[PDB]
């Protein structure tokens, strides 16, 4: 797999809430890649994380 293990402090606080899966999906898509930039091949997951968290400031 190569997964994150989501108990890690403050990363776990983004891997949570309404948009937690957008963090799971974005940061796993990046960690599976390691090309050059955070999600250079994955931008739709990080875009969904913006598109989700732009609804929710401090809600979770």
């Amino acid at each position: 797999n190569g997964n994150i293990n989501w108990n890690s402090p403050c990363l776990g606080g983004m891997a949570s809430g309404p948009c937690g899966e957008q963090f799971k999906s974005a940061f796993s898509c990046f960690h599976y890649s390691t090309e050059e930039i955070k999600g250079s091949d994955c931008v739709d997951q990080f875009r969904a994380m913006q598109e989700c968290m732009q609804k929710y400031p401090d809600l979770y």
């Binding site: 990363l11 963090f23 990080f46 994380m49």
Partner: peptide
């Protein structure tokens, strides 16, 4: 240890992509 050693890069990369895409 402190909380979130990659967390500014989490927030600021999703902001930078929030401007770029």
């Amino acid at each position: 240890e402190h909380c979130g050693h990659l967390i500014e890069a989490h927030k600021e990369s999703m902001r930078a992509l929030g401007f770029k895409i």
